[PDB]
Design a protein around this ligand. Structure first.
Ligand SMILES: Cc1cc2nc3c(=O)[nH]c(=O)nc-3n(C[C@H](O)[C@H](O)[C@H](O)COP(=O)(O)OP(=O)(O)OC[C@H]3O[C@@H](n4cnc5c(N)ncnc54)[C@H](O)[C@@H]3O)c2cc1C
Ligand SMILES: Cc1cc2nc3c(=O)[nH]c(=O)nc-3n(C[C@H](O)[C@H](O)[C@H](O)COP(=O)(O)OP(=O)(O)OC[C@H]3O[C@@H](n4cnc5c(N)ncnc54)[C@H](O)[C@@H]3O)c2cc1C
Ligand SMILES: COc1ccc(C2=Nc3ccc(OC)cc3C2=O)cc1
Ligand SMILES: COc1ccc(C2=Nc3ccc(OC)cc3C2=O)cc1
Ligand SMILES: [Zn+2]
Ligand SMILES: [Zn+2]
Lengths: 229, 230
């Protein structure tokens, strides 16, 4: 049996991102996987890291330190319910798929907020430890991203540089840090420019890849993979 | 001529190390006679989510909502939400934009990511074409003032986090350079939580000292070579 969490960040159900999320739900559901979707915009997910994330009284109510307060609230089971609901979905998942349009070579702020607030100290990592000692060890993560820019722009000699360059903070700094094994990203380049046929072909390539997702090996999530030859 | 500075600040606590770096920036630039504005994102309860609430008028396509298309059209028509246009006015007037923030997941905190997503809209910060050296914010300077949990040693080529320049790429190149900003060398204050009282005071004083000569600095070559070598 396999459990999948899809963290989805798009405002429009009829969008290309919406179609990629729906095809993921359809394919994984067909296989018999347990599937859950966290539709961040539909949930009006709170992205700001604030004192509202801790219930009851604070460890130090005179000087607010977000990381210290959330770490202590995690251990004392005093985190806001919106955070703990996401943590329960992550804890149960074997695979976490992030479905999003690229915003400023990164995730939209609503999804950045999910990472900031859900992946807290004590839950996803400790100080120490992280990376191979990360608390989410054994889990798989996959970034499914759509861009405005073409594939040619996202090349070593392209104006945007190699697409692997923008993946570093997400794949290494976040996912690998928490102990996830990272599967090769799914990048759907410039669907807004692409024809109806090319767009259908991009969602079919995603559905086809999902058919054998459990047979995939993770990438070596290293500086060499992201920046070297 | 008189210089205008916008500080986009993202920390919940005024007594924080970030708070002290922002205050020292305000003090030093104010002493020099600069015009200074601070956008304190958490105190403003700044909306980070990119939604249909960011447009006030008739949507260009109300059946299929496309955020970038809708905000581009709303910018041109002057139907964007007032919280966005208030920030755009601060950016338009600034000669230098300083971003003061703790590093969150090798990036900006989500509240600041939201400022970038919503404020730097098509028509205002860039156009297609009209990006990188043709960006609409050409002539402006930007500077990232970052604090980390990780030590300087961790942020080296052979360190567990890799070179600090690696995480700067989406912010400096993908965002600031793309909008036409000339990027000044980042200010990175490594691990203030671990550092002694003397080392902490030293990092604050190095920032204050650097600001004394900020108008004499040249921007970095914001290229893949500067960030990644080889
Ligand atoms: C704040 C902001 C920052 C951005 N920063 C960047 C950046 O740094 N780099 C970059 O490259 N881009 C950037 N972009 C662009 C952004 O990444 C793209 O606009 C986005 O990825 C397009 O994906 P979408 O799902 O929204 O496309 P859509 O506009 O929803 O999809 C395109 C078309 O596909 C159609 N479609 C939907 N489902 C299907 C289907 N099943 N079969 C066929 N066609 C279908 C839709 O009807 C539509 O006509 C940014 C945009 C914004 C708003
Ligand atoms: C969601 C999240 C994600 C994170 N991700 C990362 C990551 O990817 N990488 C990473 O490296 N770190 C990460 N961190 C850690 C974070 O970057 C640091 O905690 C932060 O940079 C510390 O800065 P601060 O202002 O909060 O420090 P503080 O805790 O406020 O400051 C440390 C000390 O400095 C003192 N101080 C304040 N002002 C002065 C002054 N004027 N003179 C002397 N001492 C002073 C304070 O009193 C305190 O004792 C993450 C944290 C969170 C919450
Ligand atoms: C054929 O030439 C093209 C096609 C698409 C784009 C892009 N559309 C975008 C839309 C929005 C963004 O936000 C920063 C960034 C981008 C691009 O880079 C640029 C050039
Ligand atoms: C040898 O001493 C240290 C001290 C602090 C840290 C760090 N604190 C942090 C706090 C929160 C984070 O979020 C991912 C990331 C980090 C670090 O990397 C790492 C090693
Ligand atoms: Zn890695
Ligand atoms: Zn650049």
């Amino acid at each position: 049996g396999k459990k999948v969490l899809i963290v989805y960040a798009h405002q429009e159900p009829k969008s290309f991102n919406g179609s990629l999320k729906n095809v993921a739900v359809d394919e994984l559901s067909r296989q018999g996987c347990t599937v859950t979707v966290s539709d961040l915009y539909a949930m009006n997910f709170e992205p700001r890291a604030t004192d509202k994330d801790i219930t009851g009284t604070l460890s130090n109510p005179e000087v607010f330190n977000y990381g210290v307060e959330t770490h202590e609230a995690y251990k004392q089971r005093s985190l806001a319910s919106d955070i703990t609901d996401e943590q329960k979905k992550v804890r149960e998942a074997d695979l976490v798929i992030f479905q999003f349009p690229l915003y400023w070579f990164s995730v939209p702020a609503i999804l950045k907020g999910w990472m900031d607030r859900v992946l807290c100290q004590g839950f996803a990592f400790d100080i120490p430890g992280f990376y191979d000692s990360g608390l989410l060890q054994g889990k798989l993560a996959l970034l499914s991203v759509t861009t405005g820019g073409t594939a040619e722009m996202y090349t070593k000699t392209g104006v945007n540089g190699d697409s692997r360059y923008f993946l570093w903070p997400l794949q290494h700094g976040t996912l690998h840090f928490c102990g996830f094994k990272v599967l090769a990203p799914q990048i759907s380049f410039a669907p807004e420019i692409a024809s109806e046929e090319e767009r259908k072909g991009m969602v079919a390539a995603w559905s086809q890849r999902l058919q054998t997702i459990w047979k995939e090996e993770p990438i070596p999530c290293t500086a060499h993979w992201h920046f070297g030859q």
